[PDB]
Homo-oligomer: A and B are copies of this chain.
Amino acid sequence: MLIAFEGIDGSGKTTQAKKLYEYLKQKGYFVSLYREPGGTKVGEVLREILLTEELDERTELLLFEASRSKLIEEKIIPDLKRDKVVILDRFVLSTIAYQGYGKGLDVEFIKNLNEFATRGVKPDITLLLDIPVDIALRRLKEKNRFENKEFLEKVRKGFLELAKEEENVVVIDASGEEEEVFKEILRALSGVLRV
Residues of chain A having any CB pair with chain B under 8 Å: 100-101, 104, 106-108, 141-142, 144, 146, 165
> In the complex, A107→B100 CA distance in Å?
31
Q: Give the shortest distance, in Å, between A148 (CB) and chain B (any CB).
A: 10
Residues in chain B near residue A142, CB distance under 8 A:
106
> In the complex, A144→B141 CA distance in Å?
31
> In the complex, A144→B142 CA distance in Å?
34
Contact B146 A100 (CB under 8 A): no
Specify which of B100, B146, B165 is in contact with A144 (CB 8 Å cutoff).
B100
Contact B165 A106 (CB under 8 A): no
Contact A106 B144 (CB under 8 A): yes
> In the complex, A170→B91 CA distance in Å?
37
**Closest 6 A/B residue pairs (Cβ):** A107-B144, A108-B141, A100-B144, A101-B144, A106-B144, A107-B141
Residues in chain B near residue A101, CB distance under 8 A:
144
> In the complex, A28→B104 CA distance in Å?
37
Residues in chain B near residue A146, CB distance under 8 A:
107, 165
Residues in chain B near residue A100, CB distance under 8 A:
144
> In the complex, A107→B144 CA distance in Å?
6
Q: Give the shortest distance, in Å, between A188 (CB) and chain B (any CB).
A: 20
> In the complex, A141→B141 CA distance in Å?
35
> In the complex, A30→B104 CA distance in Å?
35
Residues in chain B near residue A106, CB distance under 8 A:
141-142, 144
Nearest CB in chain B to that of A158: its residue: B144
Q: Give the shortest distance, in Å, between A131 (CB) and chain B (any CB).
A: 15
> In the complex, A116→B165 CA distance in Å?
37
Q: Give the shortest distance, in Å, between A110 (CB) and chain B (any CB).
A: 10
